[PDB]
Amino acid sequence: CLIANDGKADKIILAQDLLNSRISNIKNVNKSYGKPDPEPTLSQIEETHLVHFNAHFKPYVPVGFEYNKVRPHTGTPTLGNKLTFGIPQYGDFFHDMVGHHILGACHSSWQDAPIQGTSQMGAHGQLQTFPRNGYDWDNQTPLEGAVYTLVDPFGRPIVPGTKNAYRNLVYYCEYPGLRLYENVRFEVNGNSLDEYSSDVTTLVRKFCIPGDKMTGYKHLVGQEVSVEGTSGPLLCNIHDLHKPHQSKPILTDENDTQRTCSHTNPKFLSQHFPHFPENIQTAGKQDITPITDATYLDIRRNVHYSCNGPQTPKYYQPPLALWIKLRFWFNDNVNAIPSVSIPFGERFITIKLASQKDLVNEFPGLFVRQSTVIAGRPSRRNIRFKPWFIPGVINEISLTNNELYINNLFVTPEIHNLYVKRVRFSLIRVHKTQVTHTNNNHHDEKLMSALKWPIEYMFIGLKPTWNISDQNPHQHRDWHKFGHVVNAIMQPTHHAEISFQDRDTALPDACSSISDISPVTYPITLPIIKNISVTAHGINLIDKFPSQFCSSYIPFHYGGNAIKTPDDPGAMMITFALYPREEYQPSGHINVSRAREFYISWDSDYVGSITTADLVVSSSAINFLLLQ
Amino acid sequence: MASGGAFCLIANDGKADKIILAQDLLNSRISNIKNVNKSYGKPDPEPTLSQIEETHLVHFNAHFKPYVPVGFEYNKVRPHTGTPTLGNKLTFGIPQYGDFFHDMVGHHILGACHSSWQDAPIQGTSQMGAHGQLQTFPRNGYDWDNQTPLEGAVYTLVPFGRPIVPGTKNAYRNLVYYCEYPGLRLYENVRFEVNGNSLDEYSSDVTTLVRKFCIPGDKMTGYKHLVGQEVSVEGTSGPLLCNIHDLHKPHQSKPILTDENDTQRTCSHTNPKFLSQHFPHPENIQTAGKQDITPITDATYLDIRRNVHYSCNGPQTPKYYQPPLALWIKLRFWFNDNVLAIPSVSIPFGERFITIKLASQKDLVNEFPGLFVRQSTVIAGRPSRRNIRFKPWFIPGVINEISLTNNELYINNLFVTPEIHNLYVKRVRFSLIRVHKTQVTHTNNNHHDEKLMSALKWPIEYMFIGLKPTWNISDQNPHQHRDWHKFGHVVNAIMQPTHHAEISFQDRDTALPDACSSISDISPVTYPITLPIIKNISVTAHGINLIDKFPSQFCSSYIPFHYGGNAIKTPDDPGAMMITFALYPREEYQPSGHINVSRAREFYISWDSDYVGSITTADLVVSSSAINFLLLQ
Amino acid sequence: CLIANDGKADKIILAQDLLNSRISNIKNVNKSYGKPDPEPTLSQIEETHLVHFNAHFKPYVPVGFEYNKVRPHTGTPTLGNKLTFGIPQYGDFFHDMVGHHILGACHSSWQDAPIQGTSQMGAHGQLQTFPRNGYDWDNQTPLEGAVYTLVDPFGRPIVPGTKNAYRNLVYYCEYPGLRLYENVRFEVNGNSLDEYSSDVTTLVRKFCIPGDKMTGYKHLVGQEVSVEGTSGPLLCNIHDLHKPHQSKPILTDENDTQRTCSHTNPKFLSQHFPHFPENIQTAGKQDITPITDATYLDIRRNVHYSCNGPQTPKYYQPPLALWIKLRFWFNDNVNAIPSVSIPFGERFITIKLASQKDLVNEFPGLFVRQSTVIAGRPSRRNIRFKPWFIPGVINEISLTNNELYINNLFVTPEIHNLYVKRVRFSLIRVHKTQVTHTNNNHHDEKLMSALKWPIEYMFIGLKPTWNISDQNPHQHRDWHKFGHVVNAIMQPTHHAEISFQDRDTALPDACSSISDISPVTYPITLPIIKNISVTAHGINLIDKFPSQFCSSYIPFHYGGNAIKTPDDPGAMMITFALYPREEYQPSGHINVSRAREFYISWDSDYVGSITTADLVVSSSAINFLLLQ
DSSP: OTTOOOSSSSHHHHOHHHHHHHHHHHHHHHHHTSOSOOSOOTTTSTTSSBOSSOOOOOOBOOOBOOBOOOOOOSOOOTTSOOOOOBOOOSSSSOOOEEEEEOOOOBOOOOBOOOOSSSOOOOSSSSOOOOOGGGTBSSSSSBOSSOOOOOOOSSSOOOOOTTOOOBOOBBOOOSSOHHHHOOEEEEEETTEEEEEEETTTTHHHHTTTSOSTTHHHHHHHTTOOOEEOOOOOOEEOOOBOOOOTTTSOSOOOSSSOOOOOOOSOGGGGTSSSOTTOSSSSOOOSSOOOOOTTOSOOOOEEEEOOOEEOSTTSOBSSBOOOOOOEEOOSSSSSOOOOOOSSSSOSSOEEEEEEOOOSTTTOOOBOOOOBOOOOOOOSSSSOOOOOOBOOOOOOOOOOOOOOOEEEEEBOOBOOTTGGGTTTTSOOEEEEEEEEEOOOOBOOSSSBOOOOOSOOSOBOOOOOOOEEGGGTOTTSTTTTTSSSOOSOOEEOOBOOOOOOOOOOOSSOOSOOOSSOOOOOOOOBOOEEOOOOOOEEEEEETTEEEEEEEEHHIIIIIHHHHTTTTSOOOOSSTTOOOOOSSSSSSSSSSOOOOBOSSSOOOOOOBBOOSSOSSSSOEEOOOEEEEEEEEEOO | OOOOOSOOTTSOOOSSSHHHHOHHHHHHHHHHHHHHHHTTOOSOOSOOTTGGGGSOBOSSOOOOOOBOOEEOOOOOOOOOOOOOTTSOOOOOOOOOSSSOOOOBBOOOEEOOOOOOOOOOOOSSSOOOOSSSOOOOOOTTTTOSSSSOOOSSOOOOOOOOSOOOOOTTOOOOOOEEEOOSSTHHHHOOEEEEEETTEEEEEEETTTTTTTTTTSSOSSSHHHHHHHTTOOEEEOOOOOOEEOOOBOOOOSSSOOOOOOSSSOOOOOOOSOHHHHHHTTOOOOOSSOOOSSOOOOSSSOSSOSOEEEEOOOEEESTTSOBSOOOOEEOOOBOOSSSSSOOOOOOOSSSOSSOOBOOEEOOOSTTTOEEEOOSOBOOOOOOOSSSSOOOOOOBOOOOOOOOOOOOOOSOOOOBOOOEEOTTGGGTTSSOOOOEEEOOOOBOOEEEOOSSSBOOBOOSOOSOEEEEEEOOEEGGGTOTTSTTTTTSOSOSSEEEOOOOOOOOOOOOOOOSSOOSOOTTOOOOOOOOOOOOOEEEOOOOOBEEESSSSBSSOOBOHHIIIIIHHHHSSSSOOOOOSSTTOEEEOSSSSSSSSSSOOOOBOSSSOOOOEEEBOOSSOSSSSOEEEOOBEEEOEEEOOO | OOOOOOOSSSHHHHOHHHHHHHHHHHHHHHHHTTOSOOSOOSSSGGGSOBOSSOOOOOOBOOEEOOOOOBOOOSOOSTTSOOOOOOOOTTOSSOOOEEEEEEEOOOOOOOBOOOOSSSOOOOSSSSOOOOOGGGSBSSSSSBOSOOOOOEEOSSSOOOOOTTOOOBOOEEEEOSSOHHHHEEEEEEEETTEEEEEEEHHHHHTTTTTTSOGGGHHHHHHHTTOOEEEOOOOOEEEOOOOOOOOSSSSOOOOOSSOOOOOOOOSOHHHHSSSSOTTSSOSSOOOSSOOOSOSSOSOSOOEEEEOOOEEESTTSOBSOOOOEEOOOBOOSSSSSOOOOOOOSSSOSSOEEEEEEEOOSTTTEEEEOOSEEOOOOOOOSSTTOOOOOOBOOOOOOOOOOOOEEEEEEEEOOOEEOTTTTTTSTTOOOOBOOOOOOBOOOOOOOSSSOOOBOOSOOSOBOOOEEEEEETTSSOTTOTTTTTSOSOSSOOBBOOBOOOOOEEOOOOSSOOSOSOSOEEOOOOOOBOOOBOOOOOOOOEEEETTEEEEOOOOTTTTTTTHHHHTTTTSOOOOSSTTOBOOOOSSSSSSSSSOOOOBOTTTSOOOEEEOOOSSOSSSSOEEEEEEOOBOOOBOOO
């Protein structure tokens, strides 16, 4: 084949001359001096080259393992720190450790009804009321004419007038997995080593986990999943564009399916199967170039995505299985924690869980009626619902099962004596965090501390405290976001304009009808920070860059594949290295022990006094320790 | 003019940077090397990057390697004139054209399908029978289901639009559609063998339990188009206006609601931000060449939105005719892997065969409802006047058994120069390869049962579990050729997006119009839901419990997540499982741990459940990945 | 654990005997040498093994950097080549370089109204007007009866009859990021080195970037992102299939919600929570052992996707930020472009920006009302809209601000002095390209030129010039496609079927209503080429293969995990190296300088003289370059 194509161009890259010279010389040497067995193996010839159809052997070192199990340590449920696990020396080494919890089923206490035509308000910072049987708009402003008739949430179970019962739907919070573990701390002999919070694990969910292993993390921490959908076949006309003044006499309305000069219609003959939208008998072959006919009424199918899980409001939430993973330096690449130079005892884990108040919301189950106003003859019907969410009390369900599977690594009894008496160092990566508060809506500043080890990574964000304020209706739905989230409700209306009058062919201002079901929300997130600057002792280490440079490009290019991009453009990222966790060998670091001073400045358009903002910052401080 | 520049953060070290930098060692070495190469008469007193790379890893310097010349050319091997679709329709030979082998691809063309002309149910009462169940539209408006006193209804039969049919006197055709993912269903058995020595072999279960655990989240559409599966295209919508609704603060503004007018005076959220980022100036009135700063508390007013609609097309939609598909198939071996494989320098002429046992027709193609038995157009008095509810009505019977047309076996090679082709023609060498195992088994004992594993003799370093209920494979089920590759009890969740047309021509009596209404429908809509079956896994060998009992979601979603090495996706359907006795699960070529089943001839798999029984059993499939090597000659 | 299961088959792969022999020999050596460490360390054992619970170190050389900034070179606005940047001598090396451009907001030219039911035609390749106030269909045919009014797109703000004003919506082009830079060029001291065009940037977006960073790319190059949506809860009637005739209810309208067969109820009643579809009391347990039925009214929540961004049609587009990356051999893996031995200055870029007439379209701003006919009582009303407009969006928005963020690589002044007097060659990659025109609808061929350097890469795509044709109404929205696209319109109507007659229970042919809002499109692509053939001087390199081979298998299997697959089946790809741009080492190449002749043939079904086609070809050549 084309393998004899070389010369002055690819000579240096190929080295065919030196290769053949080496082969001939080694063949002569082996035939004359050595054993009478020419044509050596792929070891001597592969000394000044690189062959492809070959491999490199390496006697594998022995190792085994078995997934262990550890129970809690007599921990009260969710109220306090519901766990303090141990490290029982079952195996020999340590590795990843996963938590396990089963949240109890939640219910809803029986609620009352709006006894009279006007009941007192109060369920949030605001509330609603349905006044005087539709005669008024909202407690005043007498409208033209309207009426009220109470409905119920899950469909149309019409509730009797102002005296009945109605429960309240209960739904969990989005991403409830990494909300329970509000704080973690792993200490040996009392010396705390690493830790994080509910913010660091939120600043890693967007970055570390690649898009390949997505459904795993989406089903492991009790997050709702988007199940596929389908439908039946629905006919749709197909319309192409040919040319101007070529086949455009006029657009057809009810007849004359002709006057269409094609665009090489054999191209649209075997691709869309245009001869089979009709019930009449069709041959088992093609139908070529009919009179002004290229493609007619292809078959199209629609898709209706849906979901089902904890985020769907139901009268009874079944007990989910919210797995939680511990991300440390031991729960990383095994290329860790020998667990043999540590004596028996003084090895604990502290997990300060959260409360039940910020995990179980409610949903309105009343749906105060809509003012079916008849504005004279035109616009006869009209329905616009408004929730009537007088509160309930949820329940006191708590977790019952708690486990921590801690796999180990076994070692043969021969290797088990050389590393137990000696001491060995190793470079590990840990977490640091120092969150603060901010103000000064103008071009403010701040300062960073609690960072003393050499740093080769970073993270910046800006979480408004308004998102964590318990009085917000979307506190337990959009808390992990990183921006001022606004809702844009819509209305998938169902227009029905029918006129029974056989005469009066003018506009139908006599008989019309509108309707609706429920509002539809969309989480719209916006960025907050507009500029970023990192200075240290006068010299500006990183010039003023916009948001979309530290939020989109730096995560895009750096890290290769092991770093995705945040779906929200608010999360920042700063890197002082070339291999941000994609590799193990260090790729530089801006030291902090020698540079005490440090700064982070930024402009804003949302900080101030009414809507404050508490930024968060993490890091991966390279630091090496000694075992014994 | 040889001073320092901006003096960036590079002269910053200390107590924790010495070990990582070793600037003292670097300076000592570079100075000694400079003195050495200047003491021996060199015109370049500075050493290149060769002398400093002894114990340092520099980034701005590559490393060359003379690339040994190789090439390839996609050959083409027609079949062995085997039988059509019914029997094993292929046993491909091997031409000694090149010198090596690599990944191989199948190819197949499926003929066109049609429908057999039927007759309309001329009489208002017909005999049933098209599946395990059937129905009839009775008496043209007298009965609900073949007998019931019903007040009012009309049953006029009427697929692809509104094809109205004269009263019970016409014909019709049956819509035809293929099965989802036919590429993993056609090839039912593959067995590579030389000189009659069968080496590799698997079944139609490895082709399913690798599709979810080999391809990453990037080649999704690539595979979907390779195996001729339906694809999802994007769409747009007409520009429509949508309202906006922001929450400002508590008690900062107490405007409850106004029906028609007076929408203003609401607590603000630092307006300048919400104005610029939204540009609230949807209006026809004059819009100047700049942005307007908050006319009246205009934080967010009338944001613009556009919807998105998905759509589909291909072999997975019911049509009266199907163009010839092209179902490319791969051959998952150890040769269709990293480029070594199949030296083919000591293999004689011939004596290299493949075998591909195809499937039949009755397990791929089905029919589809075309009649759409008339809806119960009931008139329930004044309230809920109109009401529509369609229903299918089959009339099966068709063959159209067009089989696999021209089908090749595109296969590459690795040509070598005639010089190298003599140094490895006489030598013999081994290489650790991977060969798949499979031992299916039927099961019973609904309670916490167990089993015994067999058909496993090689040292094993990988594992698969699964549980596919036989109801999915039972051809008498009306949902077999749509959700057959699932690994859990599938259930359909029909719904109906009705039309609420509540018109009231009554000019007075503004109260509840309980006299006129309208309900409608179009067609059914399904939702395949997957629910796992296995609740625990406990693999044991020689009595000692090697792996304790673990929930399904630990062996389904987590164990491919923490492991895998960015090369193992996670299954959508949680029914699949996975166990690993190594550290590099197929991501690396070097083995990373394996337990031996040759010396330990005992092996057990125990699992509790609540779905097995007698009315619907379940057959579990188990794959593997052996680690065994071969020799040349 | 079970790790002592040795034998005779795993000898070659474990070498436990040789491991024990080596460790015993080194132990006896250490004991006879008189050392206080009788056990050997991890140093002498790794000669013929590979430990897994251990890592390797590498003393790293220090290196810093800082993202600099360069301004334009007083070039023209978007009309001409709006930039020719330079290089500042602030750093010591080169690396990835991102541009930055913003586009000022636009406006709309106020137009008049169609004063009468007949006016002048001509507003695009095709045009039309609203006819005869409803008497006719195109002012040339009697019709039953209708009436024509006007409406604005954003809703239905009924326009006064044939007397008002209106604007025209302004919407940007799809993927404006890879459309500005029509031609790039990099040259040092006049000598040109590499270049590309918009075709190469559109043939590298579908292949190079993995599927993970798609979210980042969509925000980088300014494309609307499909933000997730939610909806309200609604019940669905679940209905499973048990067995053939095991229990045979035919059908029922409203009753008989039982009597189906069993499917091991404890399993099918514990995963759907049958205790929360009803208002009646729900105990603190399940509802096990009910009358035989699989499930009872599961809860479902739909998901509505929604899009927003510069691609949506509005009246005023805020200033976007079209970030653009530059793909070279310098903006790639730095494991480049020293520019230390290069003199100061004398190195520029060139960016021939595109035009403004092909980046902004218009949208119809006055929809002619539909044929509101009255065809008797049944199917009386009917609405189907049609567009109507008048261009004039020639407004002069242009790119005001421009920068070029170039990072560097600072070196310690100790390494900076060893290679400042030396020259080094290194294998690099460029982007050759040669576009051409074609004809001969039948099984034609062509010739390839401007390719002489050794090639280890390829791309082929047949793009019909009907798309980029100026008069195409969909040109600046669907231009990045590689196939003849056809629009498949639909109509999600809303029906109304009411019988006003309280008696006469016959079919509701007394009142029937139709409606519509706006058409909906779904761009579908189709491949043109059916076979490929690459020959050179008689021999055949690649046999005739279907389009689905060089487009969906070769990129699939090759490239590893760094090459996505094209969603559009039009683009193809040929490889001549075993590693298609996955690694850095060369892995195959056919020199095309020794063999000057070259041919690329292909069948077709769309070429001709009505809609011609032009094939695009890129590559990645290899040719090392020297500094001094």
